[PDB]
């Protein structure tokens, strides 16, 4: 049945359905879980990385990276997509901060983003199928801590914790049971590695996953194999 | 309306909405549509149809199902 | 250039001196000041001759193929307005001054002026042209409404014969052409026949 | 105006007194001259003021968003190369921008002079405005590439001192920074009437 | 043809620990005359900030229209009314924008900031961004701001005590100096507008000046 | 299907456009409209199917006013119907900036109807879908009425009916003095027009869209005014009765 | 327009406490030519808005082509709503502002005068964008002799009647026709009132050359 | 079908453009949007989906310009673009005139935009059906837009999945419109969207979002505990 209606962004189905958006939704899946939560002393990510065999550096499979001193990326999806919307997210913030100078509350980030994750096939800009990333932005701004949420096909929203990536649906029932409001950035720690233990298949240990924290003080901290260690 | 004559179909259903999602439908569709609202109330512990069982029908009748898709307001 | 326009109920008589003295020095001796637009419709120009062209060509352009797609005859109006659109938009560019009479069915007998800029207005009389002030009084001195066809045809004979002998930038045959019903009736005033005031 | 800035070593001094002259009015004594263009870079102003202010803060914007991009550092080097190619684009339609792009790096310290006028220049010490020539002898009889700290400090404060007593667009306050491999810091900040006593 | 006609403008603002003032002559003159006796300079861009423009008064209306309508953007794409400071920084890109025709609108912005205290940033047209403590603008600009230089900064005096400034004190220092501009500047007069600005609102205060 | 009726750029091997032809299909399915041409103005008509009660009466408008003086009457497609009035009300606006007097009908319905032309020629964009008819009085000119299909022809009419009942329409109008008739008197027998096309079992609610032009308003295109609109309504319904007599 | 080629000159305007009243002369200037002298320089943009202006009398005719045009299309619109005095005044200031910027000035000078909703709206639109609303305009090298009597008049006394105000702009063209080597007398004192816009044909003041002999 | 339904440019040989009945389609799968008016105000009320009980809950009512107020049932990309677009219309009607943009034109702009991307194979049409609100000089006014542009000037409408229990509840209740009270006008609202529930659920603080507008009432949206006044005091 969907041999014409799935073959282009700009055809709907009968049902109503942009096919090719729900197929990057699928691609994106296939990415290696991350998990942020945002708790009122800050954020928290921790990702799981996929390496295949030592000679790859720790430094080339990036599923966290810096946005501006008050965010955290935590990315799921194709990498040359998530390169070009962590580029559109870095350029602007600062765009703001230059204009503006204050900081990109991460409500207007992840809308930026978003803005430009929307614009698949519009004659007026250049893309032609959707970013196949599913990003997770998580940082403090004024509303005290936050975390951001988009999807590839240009929806975001707040998330007070949410797991992304092919440890999905496998991960949202334990942050379900397991997340509450009031919680200190150390459960939330040990609550996300837990559930990355849970839901990895290599034995959790300090050099298959990344830890990152945003806090109303202290900027993106990127732990390090000390601190891993430590944590673990 | 003829083949839910002996059903217990409350008042504000649209039947003139249904047949505009009926949408090249034949026949045999409108009363497997009727059949399937009719049960589809009776699961649920309903005492009666109404315009959303009747959509419910019709997804089922096409054999779709209704998602709410991550990406619509 | 001196170039004058009048109406008589009926019909409208312009006509227009034949010097083209180009900064003095030689010129043409005689000129076409009237050009015909369409049929009925004809412009006086005045100021350089190279702009003046060029906007009658394109008017005559624009109003032929007006009037062919209409299947009506072209109104006075549209022609002038044509006339001060182009001028209006190339004000800078373009420097001249043009008056757009003629006959037409629905207000036949017009004559409108459009001088430097978009200045677009009917008038009963119009003078125009370097010679214009020479004879901007002696163009209401003698202005009686309800003019017949010869009438207009003497006021127009004397206005600019008195222009030309008081104004060197105008001089030679005075063209009039009265339009109307019947078509355009033109002559030429060479070089006694015009009006000698002592 | 009156700016300067030098190396000596230990790190790069960055002296400015704070003053905007409108034709014969003074608009305020309270300018700003050196900019933080970054913790890492300091940036000083000379001319016009406003291109001067825009150019370097987009110039902060691009080295933030480099070091980002680069999970490294910006060259004062690649720096000051930004600002010369961005102000030379639009080469003399009216930006009048001096200004000196001071820190540290991985090759240690480095001080540059960028103006509109295309004139990047690598250099030990430099000054600019209306009273660099007046600030330019005493702080060359006065400079050394061994200098302690303080007294490189007293230096830069008394030559822009005698910058403001000499040459009048240079008055104001006598904003003092130190450049160093952590940083830069805010060393002093005192208006020249107390000068005028302590000398 | 000369795209600039200067229109005559007298601003003032000062700062504080609790309220900011901007004060504007309403004498819209242009050349020699004086054809608006009523025009105020001061335009309340917000709850906590008012902008007080001099200078050629199409171009007055032109960047206050533009402010507002950012002032509408950043609303709907950032879900919160802009800060002082944000505002100060926005301003400075919009008129260094246009920075090769540049626009003739001297700007003092005053405003509470984020903690709370009076802010008052002054500019020049091609966008020069100061945040000072009190400072006039226009054209009795030299005539104001240094009597605030004897009586807000204590500058040139000694043996003072540095008595935070008080609402009433200040609201006294701007009518005279404004009187006194008035009485020794033409472009003044036509009657002045106070805005005080604090945690109530932007209180509009307005006094008779000579209309001369 | 066929294999030559996809897009509007391929000659179906007999000399047809099936493109077109769908597009004439989909404007015989719209509510009908009636226009008459009298000695002395036009008048329109069009049988407007409220499809709910929540909207206001004073939805969807299919009497629009193309410049001062010239109304159009549409039945089809009607987000289409806004566009080729706004292509109208532009192409208006153009001709009396450009000349200086009030657009001819006859030269307007031609423009209209080369734009039209143009979207049935390209193979990247359909022919317009919905029919409509071009009115107007001038003391000069004199009462005009033109149609204007998706095929682009403009035929001048005395009168004319477009959408589901334009053969009733036709057949009913030709049962009148057109030639002699005045604007009040044609009213009525526009509303009488309507009532006898329009079909209540199948479109279940319905009301009336009436407007004239003519000397009578001095070429001011005007929506026919509450009174007239209501006697109208009510020599409509007794003529339906004596019809059912 | 960098050259003005055909200028008009004054146009007043003042403030009847049930109407705007605005005044201009039909003479049509070339630089002390007198050329056109019964031309329209008052027009009524709809039933509540009228302009006149005192510049190059062809912008003031573009300028009617562009407001007739879109009054006549907020008409067909025919949604009822209305381009009020204040909307007409701020698209009017935008208008010469944007022909500034681009350094092609609309060499005009135009007062703009209504009544809507029970208030009463006058204009100055210059060339470069200076505009402002004022309760007595007076506009054109006209406007430092006229602008005193009417500004005098409503601060000793503030509301205006429609007899006094329109004997007031008789008096005030008469001074310009005295005192104004580009006037004429003969003027339109157009007139917008609760009613409609009357633009009362061909006036003229009965110049008393004997008051001085 | 199957050779006439892939693009906006054909016809099928029966007198219907498929692709934009497919996007009719597509407002039906937002969520239940029941909007409405008075003398004097206009009213929309929403369903919020949630995705989680973590993730928040998509806002479904955007504020354009001071004097409108838009509530989306579609693709939230399309309700995103046209938000930006009629804010863009609103802001340069402020610029040019001072006056702001009648709602009964800013919908004619909306459709003439959205007609655009029904005609030309270069674009696919828009997917949300759109309820406008506001209150211009003449009255309150709530206007419905769909993907087919055609705009409605609905006394009180309803769109989105579940979309007819509100229309319904429009033809029973509407009655009583053109003369209700401030916050009586909002029950009824209210009570519009509980029709539309699949019951067992009901409207709470977090799932019902209102905006309003009118007369002394620039737009306004009553989130988290800013709905309670409503829901505390709607009847049971």
Request: with cysteine.
């Amino acid at each position: 049945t969907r041999s014409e209606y799935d073959r282009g962004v700009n055809t709907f189905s009968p049902e109503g359905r942009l096919f090719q958006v729900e197929y990057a939704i699928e691609a994106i899946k296939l990415g290696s879980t991350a998990i942020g939560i945002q708790t009122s002393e800050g954020v928290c990510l921790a990702v799981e990385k996929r390496i295949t065999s030592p000679l790859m550096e720790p430094s080339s499979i990036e599923k966290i990276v810096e946005i501006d001193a008050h965010i955290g990326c935590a990315m799921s999806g194709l990498i040359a997509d998530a390169k070009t919307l962590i580029d559109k997210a870095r350029v602007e913030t600062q765009n703001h901060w230059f204009t503006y100078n204050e900081t990109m509350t991460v409500e207007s980030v992840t809308q930026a983003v978003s803005n430009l994750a929307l614009q698949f096939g519009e004659e007026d800009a250049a893309m032609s199928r959707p970013f196949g990333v599913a990003l997770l932005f998580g940082g403090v701004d004024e509303k005290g801590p936050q975390l951001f949420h988009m999807d590839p096909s240009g929806t975001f929203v707040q998330c007070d914790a949410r797991a992304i990536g092919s440890a999905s649906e496998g991960a949202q029932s334990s942050l379900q049971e397991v997340y509450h409001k009031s919680m200190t950035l150390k459960e939330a720690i040990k609550s996300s590695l837990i559930i990355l233990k849970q839901v990895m298949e290599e034995k959790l240990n300090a050099t298959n996953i990344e830890l990152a924290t945003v806090q109303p003080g202290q900027n993106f901290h990127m732990f390090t194999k000390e601190e891993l260690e430590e944590v673990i | 309306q003829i083949h839910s004559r002996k059903m217990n179909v409350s008042p504000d259903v649209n039947y003139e909405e249904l047949a505009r999602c009926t949408d090249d439908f034949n026949g045999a569709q409108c009363k497997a549509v009727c059949v399937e609202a009719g049960m589809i109330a009776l699961r649920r512990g309903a005492t009666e149809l109404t315009h959303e069982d009747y959509m419910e029908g019709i997804l089922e009748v096409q054999a779709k199902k209704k998602a709410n898709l991550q990406y619509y307001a | 250039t001196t170039i004058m326009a009048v109406q008589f109920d009926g019909g409208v008589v312009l006509g227009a001196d034949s010097r083209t003295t180009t900064g003095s020095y030689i010129a043409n001796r005689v000129t076409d000041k009237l050009t015909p637009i369409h049929d009925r419709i004809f412009c006086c120009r005045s100021g350089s001759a190279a702009d003046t062209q060029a906007v009658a060509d394109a008017v005559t352009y624009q109003l032929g193929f007006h009037s062919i797609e209409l299947n009506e005859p072209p109104l006075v109006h549209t022609a002038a307005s044509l006339f001060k659109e182009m001028c209006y938009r190339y004000r800078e560019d373009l420097m001249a001054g043009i008056i757009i009479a003629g006959w037409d069915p629905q207000e036949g007998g017009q004559v409108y002026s459009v001088p430097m800029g978009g200045m677009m207005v009917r008038q009963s009389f119009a003078i125009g042209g370097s010679g214009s002030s020479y004879i901007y009084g002696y163009v209401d001195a003698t202005y009686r409404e309800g003019m017949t066809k010869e009438e207009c045809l003497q006021f127009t004979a004397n206005a600019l014969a008195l222009a030309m002998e008081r104004d060197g930038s105008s001089g030679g045959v005075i063209r009039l052409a009265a339009i109307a019903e019947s078509g355009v009736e033109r002559q030429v005033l060479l070089g006694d026949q015009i009006p000698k005031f002592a | 105006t009156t700016t300067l800035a030098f190396k000596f070593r230990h790190g790069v001094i960055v002296a400015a007194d704070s003053r905007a002259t409108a034709g014969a009015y003074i608009a305020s004594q309270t300018v700003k001259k050196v900019i933080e263009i970054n913790p890492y870079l300091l940036g000083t102003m000379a001319g016009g003021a406003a291109d001067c202010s825009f150019w370097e803060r987009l110039l902060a914007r691009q080295c933030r968003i480099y070091e980002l991009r680069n999970k490294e550092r910006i060259s004062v080097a690649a720096a000051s190369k930004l600002l010369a190619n961005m102000v030379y684009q639009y080469k003399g339609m009216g930006l009048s921008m001096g200004t000196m792009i001071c820190g540290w790096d991985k090759r240690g310290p480095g001080l540059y002079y960028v103006d509109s006028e295309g004139n990047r220049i690598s250099g030990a010490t430099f000054s600019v405005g209306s009273g660099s020539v007046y600030a330019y002898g005493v702080m060359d009889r006065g400079y050394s590439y061994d200098l302690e700290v303080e007294q490189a400090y007293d230096l830069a404060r008394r030559a822009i001192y005698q910058a403001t007593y000499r040459d009048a667009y240079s008055g104001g306050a006598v904003n003092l920074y130190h450049v160093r491999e952590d940083g830069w810091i805010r060393v002093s900040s005192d208006n020249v009437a107390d000068l005028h006593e302590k000398y | 043809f000369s795209p600039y006609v200067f229109n005559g403008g007298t601003i003032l603002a000062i700062a504080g620990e609790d309220f900011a003032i901007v004060a504007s002559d309403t004498r819209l003159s242009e050349g020699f005359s004086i054809h608006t006796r009523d025009s105020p300079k001061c335009y309340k861009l917000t709850d906590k900030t008012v902008i007080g423009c001099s200078g050629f008064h199409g171009d007055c209306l032109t960047l206050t229209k533009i402010i507002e309508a950012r002032l509408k953007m950043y609303k709907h794409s950032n879900n919160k009314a802009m800060t002082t400071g944000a505002i100060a920084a926005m301003l400075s890109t919009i008129l260094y924008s246009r920075r090769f025709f540049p626009y003739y609108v001297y700007n003092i912005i005053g405003g509470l900031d984020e903690e709370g205290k009076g802010a008052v940033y002054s500019f020049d047209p091609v966008g020069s961004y100061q945040r000072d403590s009190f400072k006039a603008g226009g054209s009795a600009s030299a005539m104001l701001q240094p009597l605030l230089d004897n009586q807000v900064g204590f500058k040139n005096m000694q043996n003072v005590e540095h008595v935070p400034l008080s609402l009433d004190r200040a609201m006294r220092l701007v009518k005279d100096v404004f009187i006194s501009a008035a009485e020794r500047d033409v472009y003044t007069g036509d009657a002045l507008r106070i805005c005080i600005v604090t945690k109530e609102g932007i209180r509009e205060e307005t006094v008779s000046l000579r209309k001369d | 299907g066929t294999g030559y009726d996809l897009s509007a750029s391929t000659f179906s091997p007999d000399g047809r456009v099936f493109q077109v032809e769908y597009a004439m299909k989909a404007v015989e399915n719209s509510s009908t409209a009636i226009g008459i041409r009298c000695k002395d103005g036009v008048v329109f008509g069009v049988e407007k199917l409220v499809l709910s009660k929540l909207y206001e009466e004073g939805s969807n408008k299919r009497l629009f006013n193309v410049d001062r003086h010239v109304g159009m009457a549409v039945a089809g497609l009607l987000a289409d119907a806004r566009s080729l009035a706004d292509i109208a009300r532009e192409e208006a606006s153009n001709f009396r900036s450009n000349f200086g007097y009030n657009i001819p009908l006859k030269h307007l319905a031609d423009r209209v109807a080369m734009y039209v032309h143009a979207y049935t020629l390209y193979s990247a964009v359909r022919p317009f879908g919905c029919s409509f008819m071009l009115g107007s009085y001038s003391v000069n000119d004199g009462a005009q009425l033109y149609m204007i299909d998706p095929s682009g022809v403009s035929y001048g009419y005395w009168g004319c009916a477009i959408g589901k009942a334009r053969q009733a329409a036709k057949t009913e109008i030709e049962k009148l003095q057109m030639k002699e008739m005045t604007c009040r008197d044609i009213v009525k027998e526009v509303a009488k027009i309507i009532y006898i096309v329009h079909d209540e079992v199948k479109d279940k609610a319905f009301e009336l869209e009436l407007s004239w032009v003519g000397e009578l308003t001095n070429g001011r295109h005007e929506i026919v005014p509450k009174d007239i609109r209501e006697e109208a309504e009510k020599y409509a319904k007794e003529s339906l009765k004596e019809e059912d007599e | 327009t960098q050259n003005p080629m055909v200028t008009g000159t004054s146009v007043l305007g003042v403030k009847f406490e049930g109407g705007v009243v605005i005044a201009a002369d039909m003479l049509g200037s070339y630089g002390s030519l007198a050329r056109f002298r019964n031309i329209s320089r008052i027009m009524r943009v709809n039933n509540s808005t009228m302009l006149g202006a005192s510049g190059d009398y062809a912008d003031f005719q573009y300028l009617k082509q562009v407001l007739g045009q879109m009054v006549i299309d907020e008409e067909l619109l025919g949604d009822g709503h209305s381009y009020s005095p204040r909307a007409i005044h701020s698209w009017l200031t935008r208008a010469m502002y944007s022909r500034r910027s681009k350094m092609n000035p609309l060499w005009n000078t135009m007062v703009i005068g209504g009544y809507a909703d029970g208030e009463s709206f006058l204009g100055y639109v210059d060339m470069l964008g200076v505009a402002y609303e004022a309760p007595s305009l007076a506009t054109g090298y006209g406007a430092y002799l006229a602008q005193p009597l009417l500004r005098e008049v409503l601060e000793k006394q503030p509301v205006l009647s429609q007899t006094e105000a329109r004997d007031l702009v008789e008096r005030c063209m008469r001074v310009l026709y005295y005192r104004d080597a580009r006037s004429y007398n003969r003027f339109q004192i157009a007139t917008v009132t609760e009613k409609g816009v009357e633009i009362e044909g061909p006036l003229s003041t009965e110049t008393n050359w004997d008051i001085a002999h | 079908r199957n050779q006439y339904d892939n693009d906006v440019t054909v016809w099928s040989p029966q007198g219907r453009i498929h692709q934009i009945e497919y996007a009719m389609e597509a407002v039906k799968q937002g969520s239940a949007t029941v909007g409405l008016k008075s003398k004097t105000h206009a009213v929309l009320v929403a369903l919020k989906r949630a995705q989680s009980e973590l993730a928040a809950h998509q806002k479904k009512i955007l504020h354009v310009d001071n004097h409108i107020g838009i509530s989306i049932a579609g693709l939230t990309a399309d309700a995103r673009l046209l938000c930006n677009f009629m804010r863009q219309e609103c802001l340069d009607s402020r610029f040019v005139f001072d006056r702001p943009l009648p709602v009964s034109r800013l919908v004619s702009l909306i459709g003439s935009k959205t007609q655009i991307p029904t005609q030309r194979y270069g674009r696919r049409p828009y997917g949300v059906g759109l309820l406008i609100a506001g209150y211009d000089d003449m009255g309150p006014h709530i206007f419905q837009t769909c993907p087919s542009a055609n705009y409605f000037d609905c006394r009180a409408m309803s769109i989105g999945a579940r979309s007819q229990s509100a229309r319904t509840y429009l033809e029973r209740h509407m009655s009583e419109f053109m003369e209700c009270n401030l916050n009586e006008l909002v029950k009824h609202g209210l009570r519009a969207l509980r029709e539309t529930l699949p019951a067992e659920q009901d409207l709470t603080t977090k799932n019902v979002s209102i905006g309003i507008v009118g007369k002394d009432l620039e737009f306004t949206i009553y989130d988290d505990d800013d709905v309670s006044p409503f829901l505390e005091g709607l009847e049971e």
